[PDB]
Design a protein around this nucleic acid. Structure first.
Lengths: 182, 274, 488, 167, 263
RNA sequence: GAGAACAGAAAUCUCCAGUAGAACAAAAGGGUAAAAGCCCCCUUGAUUUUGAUUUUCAGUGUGAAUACAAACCAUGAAAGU
RNA sequence: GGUUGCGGCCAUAUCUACCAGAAAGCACCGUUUCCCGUCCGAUCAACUGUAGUUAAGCUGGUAAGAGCCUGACCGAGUAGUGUAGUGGGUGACCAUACGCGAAACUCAGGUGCUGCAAUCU
């Protein structure tokens, strides 16, 4: 029936952690290990603190919406969610900050020459005779067209083509290791 | 090998038993789970012979609690005494659990701000299959029709089309008012009364027809709607005498003197040269 | 998607700090306050300590010896109703409720299939929140069971579009005014042709109405009225199966008609004119009302809630004797008929001049007030169930809420994107549902004048809407050939 | 009253490792004798001596259960003149054999197909394999209600009256 | 296939981290009491916690290879060792690691009046709810080992973080208070651990706003005796406690509208 | 292991013994099982819109790259993934 | 006390040769027209509680079985190893005082605890 709580020294709060920290004192003779009626003291001490914490939480600003069935984002019109201040508890991280900051022999060249990074528009190209689109890679890429193309007009000449293909592919994948090591 | 009886790891208890899918249960138990803190609830439904079971479940660190529950055999007291496992029996069980819950929590007839907050529940199918037009989803449809709010879809109902996306309500209406059981009744009774005699034996005890059975289901829906009270059976011949009788029929263990006596008799009789 | 600007650095420091523990702590003034009603009453100047609002209800109920709570309003300043002395002798007004609360309409059931055409009109049943009939653009109509969401007694008979549907306030007659210029009565239980159609009109049927229960001799059948583009209003007796007589005041099309409470009829037409008939003089016109600038549409009255429920209450205790039905109608009518203690029912007329008119037909042919403010043609209007408010839906994506007594402005409900088509008050004056030319439907809380829930789900625009009688379901439908029931 | 010897299933198999038309003919004799659609089979690897590859479409069989399964069982047991051996009975209590010239039961010559035969196998049991066949509460059977060889050998030297064939 | 690279992405060092994984490894000495205390603790870290089955002869304050190997191989940052001895009865070794390096270790001793979940009136719970925290005594603002244990328990139990908190999901509360008052030099007091479940009853004196509370125990109830500690290296502290990095006379009002001041 | 006509040492079948000794875009810490293994059905992916990093001569409202988020898109009855 | 549904702790809960189980619960069990899937209604689907029996399935017990589990000065306050003195041997690597802190062997003992709800002569 009584609601308020008083303390000679007022508590401090971490309202994002739903937690409170106390600078008040205990009494050894209220909670001695040899004391039978002992946990009544913890109860009569911490009921006041959870009182003050619910008191600070229900005095918060809140959040409401107007949504409906199948709400894919969040709450609905019936939910009402309090908005908590952010934590001030500085508690450590478990892994350092993931800083992979190098340049790797192309970014430096593109900086020391006026090359701008390209626009990254589409995967597909346009075929002429026929009139399909047939992407340049991703599905039946226009690279692998000399593969099935029947007659070649002057060693089998398509095998050389695949040989050069994999030549450049492996040069790229080699320079990959070169940049990773340096 | 003793090493082969020693080295391996066993599944959990209810996993050695065929009762619980722990994978699906984890997919249930970790709700979202990065957004908010709203407690989850569950609607468990099981289909055996002669029993349809439906319950509302809220888990805990002790392991589980049942908030409400219904069993296919209260339907006599509202007016369903036959076919306690069909699609309409499932509809009735779900409608009963819905109305029971919404009366017991007092909807009609710390969250101090607002408000009604329609009740949320997720259907747990258990080890049951997911086949088009089943009676688990009949109980689901009945539960939702009763007034609960259960997220679900519209392809797992009797009549839905795999050809295109439509759900014919005629076949649903028949499956609610026993049109299937009654069309089967007619297709059997027009020809033979031996299969029709064995089958529908209570229906020859009470002389029921197809239109009358649709009538029974119609009346019984609003009969459930009227008073879903769930008073328990009156408990005749109670628990202490129950346990005394079960104790009488139950076997017991032994004592160390009994075991030493068995060992002595055996190794002195059949071990000393016959 | 556009977002809300995130907070600032200092704005987060204002969040981390404590805030405003409120205790209503001590809290002892020698405070003075005077009670008052709204029409006339003022019943007196004391010095208490504190009190709660529920306790104001209790104290007034004990001072008058009623044993129903009230709503309490102070300092009639936007009229804001230790919770009423914190925003700054106090003037307090007490206003009864007829307390019967229902849950808002939030979720959805599934879209019921059926006829393959654009649904046109809809109507629940007055005596059961489980029965509904709609008339679709197809040459038929349909009745649905709402409790398992399945059709029931697919009804046929008309040979054109079934424009207007109506229910009889007793629960026996479903009248389907068809585009073919006749009507057909229907049996809500079997769906058989009650004889044949009630022919007599020339151009397509538009609207229908019924005599209220408190105006039929106990043991006699109710009568209907029907209007068409012809410009006349034909009376119909349910059992004679012939028209009795016609009233022919207007020249152009008559849009809607309504069978008022004290034995009168009202008809607005496309003649920018509203005309009043007395029926006990064999259907004679008395008052012509020429105050509009463009043709008038959807004339409405005050007590249509009582004129429509038909002695059925918000519980559903079906009638025992015709005399019991008559006494029920009389009580449920006088509940809101003599609000100030004088038998009063008003009329509100909307028209394309972007204005609306308040009318008191017993009093004069002058209007009381003219409400302006809309920017496109006003399409629909409705009085509140308690007769305390008016609302209007226009074609400029807005809704306007009025004072239902002296015709004042209060606020505008905003949020719709295309034109608004029709609204529906709650059963308990609490919420207000609206459907519009966009996909969504919406509901509004009239207390704080804000939107509670918007709810989508359709494939095209919506044409019809209506709440239940008890406040359980709301029915929808339009150009997507699907019915939808919306509940809590 | 329950440890009976019901006839469970008869599998008629033809394993001719050919991806041609002889397999089609085996399937058509399965269609015109058993009726139901014949299910095919493939090859796990290469052997270079049996004439196969991986997924070679080597065999085809049909499983029939019930009254018609009993019918084909009695017809194929009559063709062997009721002469079955003390082997050909799996220690768990099932049997099988083979007869060529499928004019022995059913079809006629009709050289439009050739001639083949149905490698039979009759699987037998007691009633009660549902605990080892169903999904919820899938357990084991008991050595009490586990069927064995010689009891069904007696149930077989019952009607259709086989000869002893080496005890 | 790609499920393998999904794991490496999940084990990447994130801008702001995910939930904390905690591991429970058995020591070389164990009893029913100690194992059951372990399990009544792990009944709170679900469903984000891993446990080993077979025992392990590991010494925390002595060697440091297998502990870092374990914390890596399970991707966990919190390690709880449950071990006993005659020299030390029921010593719980709590371990906080950062980047697979020991951030700190702490020795705790549970008393001989402990309790299991089935010792009190077993009021219902719900699996995986955010707790509430309450800290008593004046020592928790200056005392060094006390700051360590406080931050340890916070980074242990609190799970995750959000910005929207629903109001029904406030069911239980964790109370922690020292063993009376003590002054410097004299040995340390014990710290307690009480896991309640709070309820609400209308007051009629504060309005509909603030109702009264009453607490009940569900288990366990523990007293902890502090022993050996570890302290991390200053450079590792500075590194681990860093801001993730993700303007004058310029402000943002509503509707964006980046404004400015002229002065 | 028992058997099953052609058919052998491996051809194809039916039933138990099965802790992972058969498989993995893993090599260690273990194994997920009614799977992360096999087969089957539905299906895009270089989507678009703004704060952090840097660079443009319309300094050029991000024009674009990139980090992060948020609306979406796929599937599932569903919780979800 | 028996029995069923949702579970926690996940072998003191398992594997093996047998014995037994009143009632109630549940399995076995017949069917193929409706929804549903295959080569095949054995699996899933649907129907009834209709013709039957405990052989099942399930449950308890019986075994010094395998396996497993607990406590203890059971090894062992020690094996080992971190600190202080000229303790020493030239040394392989180890004496003297505080610490930290083990294991196989052996002894006693044991082969499910239960949360939430329904139900039974």
């Amino acid at each position: 029936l009584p609601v308020t709580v008083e303390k000679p020294i007022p508590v401090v709060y971490d309202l994002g952690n739903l937690a409170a920290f106390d600078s008040n004192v205990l009494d050894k003779n209220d909670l001695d290990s040899s004391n039978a009626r002992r946990e009544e003291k913890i109860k009569s001490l911490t009921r006041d603190n959870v009182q003050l914490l619910i008191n600070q939480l229900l005095s918060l600003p809140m959040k409401t919406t107007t949504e409906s069935v199948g709400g894919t984002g969040g709450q609905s019109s019936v939910m009402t969610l309090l908005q908590l201040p952010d934590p001030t508890t500085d508690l450590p991280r478990e892994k350092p900050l993931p800083k992979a900051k190098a340049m790797t022999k192309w970014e430096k060249f593109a900086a020391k020459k006026g090359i701008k990074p390209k626009e990254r528009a589409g995967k597909m190209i346009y075929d002429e005779a026929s009139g399909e689109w047939v992407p340049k890679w991703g599905y039946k890429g226009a690279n692998k067209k000399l593969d099935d193309q029947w007659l070649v007009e002057v060693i089998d000449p398509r095998t050389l083509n695949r040989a050069e293909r994999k030549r450049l592919v492996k040069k790229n994948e080699k320079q990959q290791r070169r940049n990773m090591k340096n | 090998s003793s090493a082969y009886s020693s080295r391996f790891q066993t599944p959990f208890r209810r996993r050695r038993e065929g009762k619980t899918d722990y994978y699906q249960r984890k997919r249930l138990v970790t709700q979202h789970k990065a957004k908010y803190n709203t407690p989850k609830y569950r609607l468990v439904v099981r289909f055996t012979n002669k029993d349809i079971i439906c319950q509302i479940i809220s888990s805990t660190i002790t392991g589980d609690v049942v908030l409400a529950a219904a069993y296919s055999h209260e339907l006599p007291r509202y007016g369903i005494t036959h076919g306690l496992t069909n699609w309409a029996a499932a509809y009735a069980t779900g409608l009963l659990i819905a109305r029971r819950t919404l009366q017991k929590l007092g909807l009609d007839e710390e969250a101090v701000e607002d408000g009604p907050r329609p009740f949320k529940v997720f259907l747990d199918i258990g080890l049951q299959r997911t086949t088009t037009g089943a009676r688990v989803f009949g109980a689901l449809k009945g539960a939702s029709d009763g007034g609960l709010y259960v997220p679900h879809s519209e392809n797992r109902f009797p009549g839905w089309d795999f050809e295109t996306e439509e759900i014919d309500p005629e076949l649903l209406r028949s499956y609610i008012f026993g049109g299937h059981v009654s069309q089967y009744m007619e297709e059997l009774a027009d020809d033979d009364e031996e299969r029709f005699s064995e089958l529908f034996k209570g229906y020859l005890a009470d002389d029921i027809d197809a239109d009358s059975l649709e009538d029974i289901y119609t009346s019984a829906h609003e009969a459930i709607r009227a008073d879903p009270a769930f008073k328990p059976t009156e408990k005749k011949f109670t628990k202490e005498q129950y346990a005394a009788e079960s104790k009488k029929y139950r076997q017991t263990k032994l004592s160390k003197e009994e075991r030493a006596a068995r060992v002595a008799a055996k190794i002195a009789a059949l071990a000393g040269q016959q | 998607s556009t977002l809300i600007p995130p907070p600032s650095k200092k704005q987060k420091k204002e969040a981390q700090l404590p805030r405003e523990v409120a205790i209503i702590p001590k809290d002892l003034p020698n405070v003075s306050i005077k009670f008052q009603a709204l029409d006339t009453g003022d019943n007196a100047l004391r010095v208490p300590g504190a009190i709660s609002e529920k306790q104001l209800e209790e104290l007034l109920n004990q001072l008058n010896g009623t044993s129903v709570p009230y709503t309490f309003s102070c300092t009639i300043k936007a009229s804001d109703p230790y919770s009423s002395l914190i925003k700054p002798q106090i003037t307090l007004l007490y206003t009864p409720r007829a307390v019967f609360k229902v849950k808002p309409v939030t979720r959805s059931s599934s879209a019921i299939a059926g006829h393959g055409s654009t649904i046109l009109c809809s109507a629940f049943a007055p005596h059961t929140s489980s029965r509904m009939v709609t008339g679709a653009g197809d040459n038929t109509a349909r009745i649905w069971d709402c409790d398992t969401q399945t059709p029931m007694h697919t009804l046929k008979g008309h040979y054109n579009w079934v424009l207007c549907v109506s229910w009889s306030p007793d629960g026996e007659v479903i009248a389907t005014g068809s585009m073919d210029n006749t009507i057909r009565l229907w049996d809500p239980k079997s769906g058989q042709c009650l004889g044949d159609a009630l022919r007599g009109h020339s151009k397509w049927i538009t609207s229908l109405s019924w005599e209220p229960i408190h105006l039929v001799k106990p043991g006699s059948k109710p009568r209907l009225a029907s209007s068409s583009k012809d410009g006349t209003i034909k009376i119909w007796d349910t059992v004679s199966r012939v028209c009795q007589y016609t009233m022919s005041g207007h020249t152009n099309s008559v849009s809607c008609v309504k069978w008022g409470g004290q034995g009168l009829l009202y008809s607005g037409s496309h003649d920018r004119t509203v005309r009043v008939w007395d029926i006990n003089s064999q259907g004679r016109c008395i008052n012509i009302l020429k105050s509009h600038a463009h043709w008038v549409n959807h004339l409405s009255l005050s007590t249509d809630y009582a004129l429509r429920i038909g002695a059925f209450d918000h519980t559903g205790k079906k009638p025992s004797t015709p005399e019991e039905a008559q006494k029920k109608a009389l009580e449920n009518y006088e509940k809101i008929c003599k609000k100030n203690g004088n038998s009063e029912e008003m009329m509100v007329t909307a028209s394309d001049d972007y204005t609306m008119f308040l009318w008191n037909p017993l009093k004069s042919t002058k209007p009381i007030a003219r409400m302006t403010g809309h920017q496109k043609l006003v399409n629909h209007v409705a009085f509140s169930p308690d007769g305390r408010y008016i609302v209007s839906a226009s074609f400029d994506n807005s809704i306007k809420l009025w004072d239902g007594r002296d015709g004042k402005f209060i606020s505008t409900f905003r949020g719709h994107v295309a034109s608004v088509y029709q609204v529906a008050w709650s059963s308990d004056c609490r919420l207000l549902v609206s459907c519009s030319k966009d996909t969504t439907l919406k509901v509004w809380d009239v207390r704080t004048r804000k939107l509670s829930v918007d709810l989508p789900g359709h494939k095209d625009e919506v044409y019809t809407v209506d709440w239940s009688v008890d406040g359980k379901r709301v029915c929808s439908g339009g150009k997507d050939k699907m019915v939808r029931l919306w509940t809590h | 009253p329950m440890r009976d010897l019901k006839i469970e299933k008869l599998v008629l198999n033809i394993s001719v490792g050919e991806s041609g038309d002889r397999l089609t003919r085996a399937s058509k004799v399965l269609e015109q004798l058993s009726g139901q659609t014949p299910v095919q089979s493939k090859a796990r690897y290469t052997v270079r001596t049996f004439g196969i590859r991986r997924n070679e479409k080597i065999a085809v069989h049909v499983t029939v259960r019930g009254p018609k399964a009993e019918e084909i069982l009695e017809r194929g047991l009559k063709v062997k003149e009721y002469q079955l051996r003390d082997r050909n009975f799996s220690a768990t209590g099932n049997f099988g054999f083979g007869i060529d010239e499928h004019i022995d039961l059913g079809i006629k010559y009709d050289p439009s197909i050739g001639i083949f035969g149905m490698d039979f196998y009759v699987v037998m049991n007691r009633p009660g394999a549902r605990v080892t066949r169903r999904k919820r509460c899938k357990g084991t059977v008991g050595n009490s209600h586990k069927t064995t060889k010689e009891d069904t050998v007696s149930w077989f030297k019952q009607k259709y009256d086989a000869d002893v064939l080496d005890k | 296939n790609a499920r393998a690279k999904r794991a490496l992405v999940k084990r990447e060092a994130k801008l702001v981290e995910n939930v904390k994984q905690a591991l429970f490894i058995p020591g070389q000495s164990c009893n029913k009491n100690l194992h059951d205390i372990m399990v009544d603790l792990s009944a709170l870290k679900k469903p984000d916690m891993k446990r080993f089955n077979r025992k392990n002869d590991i010494h925390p304050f002595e060697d440091m290879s297998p502990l870092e190997f374990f914390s890596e191989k399970n991707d966990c940052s919190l390690m709880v060792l449950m071990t006993s001895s005659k020299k030390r009865k029921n010593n719980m070794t709590f371990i906080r690691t950062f980047g697979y390096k020991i951030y700190d270790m702490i020795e705790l001793m549970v008393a001989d009046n402990f309790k299991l979940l089935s010792d009190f009136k077993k009021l219902t719970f719900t699996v995986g709810l955010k707790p509430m925290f309450t800290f008593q005594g004046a020592a928790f603002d200056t005392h060094p080992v006390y700051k360590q244990i406080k931050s340890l328990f916070l980074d242990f139990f609190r799970g995750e973080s959000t910005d929207l908190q629903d109001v029904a999901g406030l069911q239980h509360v964790i109370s922690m208070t020292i063993q009376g008052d003590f002054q410097d030099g004299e040995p340390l007091p014990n710290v307690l651990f009480r896991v309640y479940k709070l309820k609400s009853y209308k007051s009629d004196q504060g309005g509909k706003r603030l109702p009264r509370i009453e607490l009940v125990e569900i288990g366990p109830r523990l007293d902890f005796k502090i022993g050996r500690i570890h302290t991390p290296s200053p450079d590792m502290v500075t590194e681990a406690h860093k801001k993730p990095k993700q303007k004058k006379n310029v402000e943002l009002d509503i509707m964006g509208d980046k404004l400015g001041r002229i002065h």
